Design a protein around this nucleic acid. Structure first.
Lengths: 121, 118
DNA sequence: TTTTTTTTTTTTTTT
């Protein structure tokens, strides 16, 4: 445990996905799926509050977590968690991306069900 | 402020540029710098590499104290939220607003004083 | 394995 003496970086962002999961599989047979999460919130800074809006291009790679994505529709309310990585050198400016290791959905069943059975009788 | 909406980034690395310390016409001291992260990771044994220069701002009186101590080369960890503005040309910029700092220099300084206090 | 240049209706924060 020597270099991990400055390798700590975890981002936890909840948000609604605005770009559907674009799946692909790289040569080694690994499957990955991207999308753009839109996060919006009120954040307090300096004893006051201000809005925090951001589009985070997240991507989930490898087997374990592919399933949970096949289940994330557009306008999904999710919280993703994993490391951040980026780059924008003037010889190929790529972008900031949250490689995800973990995701749980944030709209409760009792919640959504409400909006599926009520209009009727 | 509870609910779904949660934004927490906890980055570490070596302060690249600055820090530029200004007090703005609103009253508060603002300290801005850029943090250069570099690390290797992923679950079991698949090797991914990580790098990123996160513009950081430390806004308010509360945290400007610990600040007069970080300079280019300074290693620290910061925790706070990420917001994204327009820029001066390129649309969205990302900035981590630090709500909590950690000079990992004091970490070594504390581990040492332990290993060596006869 | 070149920090796998991978922003694919008007570029989501400007309705």
């Amino acid at each position: 445990m020597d270099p991990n003496s400055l390798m700590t970086n975890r981002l936890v962002l909840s948000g609604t996905v605005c770009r559907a999961p674009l799946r692909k599989v790289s040569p080694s047979g690994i499957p990955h799926c991207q999308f753009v999460l839109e996060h919006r919130s009120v954040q307090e800074e300096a004893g006051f509050h201000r809005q925090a809006w951001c589009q985070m291009p997240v991507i989930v790679s490898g087997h374990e977590n592919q399933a949970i994505t096949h289940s994330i529709t557009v306008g999904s309310r999710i919280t993703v968690q994993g490391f951040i990585s980026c780059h924008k050198a003037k010889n190929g400016l790529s972008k900031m991306v949250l490689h995800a290791e973990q995701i749980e959905l944030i709209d409760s069943v009792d919640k959504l069900a409400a909006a599926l059975e009520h209009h009727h009788h």
